[PDB]
Design an enzyme around this catalytic site. Structure first.
Site, short mmCIF file in Angstrom:
data_model
loop_
_atom_site.label_atom_id
_atom_site.label_comp_id
_atom_site.label_asym_id
_atom_site.label_seq_id
_atom_site.Cartn_x
_atom_site.Cartn_y
_atom_site.Cartn_z
N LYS A 1 52.79 17.41 83.24
CA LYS A 1 51.66 16.73 83.87
C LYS A 1 50.37 17.53 83.76
CE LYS A 1 49.74 15.58 88.44
NZ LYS A 1 49.80 15.86 89.92
N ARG B 1 69.90 17.71 79.60
CA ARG B 1 68.47 17.39 79.59
C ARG B 1 68.12 16.52 78.38
N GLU C 1 59.04 13.76 92.37
CA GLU C 1 57.84 14.16 93.09
C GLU C 1 56.92 12.98 93.29
OE1 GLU C 1 54.99 16.84 92.01
OE2 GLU C 1 56.18 18.69 92.19
#
Length: 709
Positions: free
Chosen positions: A454, A444, A238
């Protein structure tokens, strides 16, 4: 062994076509020396001769007119000291040139470029150079351009490089420019495609689950015309996201897989959702990519492909496989999924022309998933202006829809992600008969004592729990850089675990184990201390030599002040000399010839010595500078997500936090130091120039200790 063959059999076993071997055995003389050359070679070689080595002996046999020198040159092609055609053609000269009988080994080896190694970067940049030099002409003649010139100019720069290697760099770099012709262990051995059993490019149809439709073969045919059979991966974050240590497996896999297999990796920003831009994070993503040693082949945005996605979405509708829905959010079956097709076109257009409010209408795919989910949403209506395409779009494709077809558009070969919904991936591409990538899921990665959302993080920085988001007790990548970790450390970290079947959560001290192994060989040594007292010798005579680093003085030495009034830590002879203590790290043992006191222990006095109690750190004529001390941020060095059920990830804020040693005493070598320089402070730990340091004011960061309990 080999000298026992029919020549036609011998010749073909050295790597000549049967055609050229029939040729050669007509030549009595050539054929004679080729057998004699190979005989000798074999005797040195031992394991049967490699074919490539064979083509070298064939050239040697067919050009050497000197022939006094054959036994010589063969020794140099058995040990693959000579192993390229211009090397062989070089020695063919040197030997024609010097009929002198005794030949200098060193003159010869040097003038054939024996120990000379040529690198893929070196060739890459030579070709790059030639291309640029012809780019306009290249672009216009396209494939009619004579590609000879490029290999010419390329050869011109690199005298001793493999001719094939140069062609293949040319051939590749041209296709990038022209496009299609329409007529533990180490990490890049660990990431070899062969060492993972991943498909060779073009051969997707050998992987689990791959659906071969009636176009899949012509689709892979077109695919290879576009990509030259090269590996292509992508790393798709992102633009406003915040990379953490998890994303290091991501980066290393995707860029590293491409690296280890001669491929390319696109940095593909996922900007399908329209946000205001925060350039803080965005640049920090490119930065962090850079920082770990990787360079994207091209940087691309998903918004680049909006026209394409919409066209494809419209095909979906025509093909009966997607529809426009009026259900809201928050699974109930939709009243609209069997609405007529022309009804769906009409409405998808209206959606696009901004005739519906956010969430008054949706495009969904007509499908039930492997896990039971019905009709996943392809397009949503959003009126927030978009940072790149501005206000051009008010409908946007959803993440799932997008990065599947973006992969197809970018002709990705290996699409690598974290566990899943892979039959739904495959579904989309086969629905449109477009090229269909292979998806592999790898495990992961989340460390203990680490919270990285975030939102959850911008929560801490907005209370004062942490100074900014590169605060060294955060496990964000940008923080670990600030904290003092070296790139190689993190890379070598993933080189300890880093396979697909992990989903492995990991303890922090396990990584700092790697940071030590790296700084102990890279970080230089200087002396300093925090709680520093002043002391004087008795009377010495009125600059010592502190080395680069202890374990090898083969680097250099820095001069460090040798005069009266030097400093040292607390944790010393503290009057009541109890059991368990000691006496310098340079000079004398400094006879403690006089003690002082206060109202405290205000100061001290000693005496000189030379020619054995212990060795402590000390600083004569020191510099004044800040040193920040950090402690593991969370009380539970295990998940602060309520597995412990603390009932609050913000209650777990461990009031340890940061202990500021203010300007304390430090060495003279640590003066030319600029930010992100690392040091071993003799007998304390490992410290790094914090970004706020300068010649005028110096600040340091405690990275990690020298062992654990």
């Amino acid at each position: 062994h080999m000298a026992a063959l029919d020549s036609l059999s011998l010749f073909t076993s050295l790597g000549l076509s049967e055609q050229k071997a029939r040729e050669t055995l007509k030549n009595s003389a050539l054929s004679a020396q080729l057998r004699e050359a190979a005989t000798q070679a074999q005797q040195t070689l031992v394991s049967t001769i490699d074919k490539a080595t064979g083509i070298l002996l064939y050239g040697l046999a067919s050009r050497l007119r000197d022939t006094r020198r054959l036994s010589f040159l063969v020794s140099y092609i058995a040990s693959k000291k000579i192993h390229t055609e211009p090397q062989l053609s070089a020695a063919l000269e040197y030997v024609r040139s010097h009929p002198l009988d005794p030949i200098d080994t060193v003159d010869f080896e040097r003038e054939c470029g024996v120990g000379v190694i040529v690198t893929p970067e070196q060739i890459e940049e030579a070709v790059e150079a030639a291309i640029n030099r012809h780019r306009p002409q290249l672009l216009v003649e396209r494939y009619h351009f004579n590609m000879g010139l490029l290999m010419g100019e390329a050869r011109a720069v690199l005298k001793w490089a493999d001719g094939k290697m140069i062609k293949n760099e040319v051939d590749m770099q041209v296709l990038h420019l022209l496009g299609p012709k329409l007529e533990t262990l180490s990490l890049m051995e660990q990431l070899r495609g062969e060492a993972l059993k991943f498909h060779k490019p073009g051969e997707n149809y050998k992987t689990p689950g791959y659906v071969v439709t009636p176009h899949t073969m012509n689709l892979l045919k077109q695919h290879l015309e576009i990509t030259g059979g090269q590996v292509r991966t992508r790393f798709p974050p992102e633009p406003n996201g915040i990379l953490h240590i998890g994303h290091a497996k991501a980066i290393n896999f995707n860029f590293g897989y491409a690296k280890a297999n001669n491929g390319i990796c696109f940095l593909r920003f996922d900007d399908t959702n329209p946000e205001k831009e925060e350039a803080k994070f965005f640049t920090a993503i490119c930065d962090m990519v850079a920082w770990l040693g990787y360079t994207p082949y091209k940087v691309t945005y998903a918004s680049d492909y909006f026209d394409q996605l919409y066209a494809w979405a419209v095909e979906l509708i025509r093909r009966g496989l997607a529809y426009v829905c009026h259900q809201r959010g928050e699974t109930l079956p939709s009243p609209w999924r069997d609405r007529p097709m022309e009804e769906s076109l009409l409405l998808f257009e209206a959606m696009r022309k901004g005739k519906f409010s956010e969430g008054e209408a949706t495009l969904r795919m007509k499908l039930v998933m492997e896990d039971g989910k019905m009709d996943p949403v392809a397009y949503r209506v959003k009126y927030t202006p978009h940072h790149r395409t501005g206000d051009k779009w008010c409908i946007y494709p959803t993440y799932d829809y997008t990065h599947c077809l973006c992969d197809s558009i970018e002709h990705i070969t290996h699409s690598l992600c974290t566990k899943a919904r892979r039959s739904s991936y495959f579904w989309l591409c086969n629905a449109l008969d477009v090229y269909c990538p292979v998806q592999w899921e790898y495990g992961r990665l989340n460390l203990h004592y680490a919270v990285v959302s975030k939102r959850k993080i911008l929560q801490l920085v907005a209370t004062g729990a942490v100074r900014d988001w590169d605060d060294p007790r955060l496990f964000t990548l940008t923080a670990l850089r600030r904290r003092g970790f070296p790139p190689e450390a993190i890379n070598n970290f993933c080189a300890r675990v880093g396979v697909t079947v992990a989903q492995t959560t990991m303890e922090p001290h396990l990584l700092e184990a790697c940071v030590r192994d790296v700084l102990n060989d890279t970080a230089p040594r200087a002396m300093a201390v925090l709680e520093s007292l002043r002391v004087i010798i008795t009377n010495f005579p009125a600059d010592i030599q502190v080395p680069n680093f202890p374990a090898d003085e083969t680097k250099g030495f820095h001069q460090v002040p040798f005069a009266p009034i030097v400093f040292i830590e607390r944790t010393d002879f503290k009057e009541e000399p109890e059991p368990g203590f000691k006496r310098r790290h340079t000079g004398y043992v400094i006879e403690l010839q006089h003690v002082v006191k206060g109202p405290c222990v205000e100061s001290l006095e000693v005496t000189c010595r030379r020619a054995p109690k212990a060795f402590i750190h000390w600083v004569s004529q020191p510099l004044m500078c800040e040193v920040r001390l950090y402690e593991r941020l969370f009380q539970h060095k295990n998940p602060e997500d309520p597995t412990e059920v603390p009932g609050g990830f913000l209650s777990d804020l461990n009031l340890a936090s940061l202990h500021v040693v203010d300007a304390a005493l430090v060495d003279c070598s640590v003066a030319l130091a600029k930010p992100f320089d690392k040091f071993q402070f003799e007998r304390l730990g490992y410290f790094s120039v914090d970004p706020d340091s300068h010649q005028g004011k110096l600040v340091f960061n405690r990275t990690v200790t020298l062992k654990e309990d």
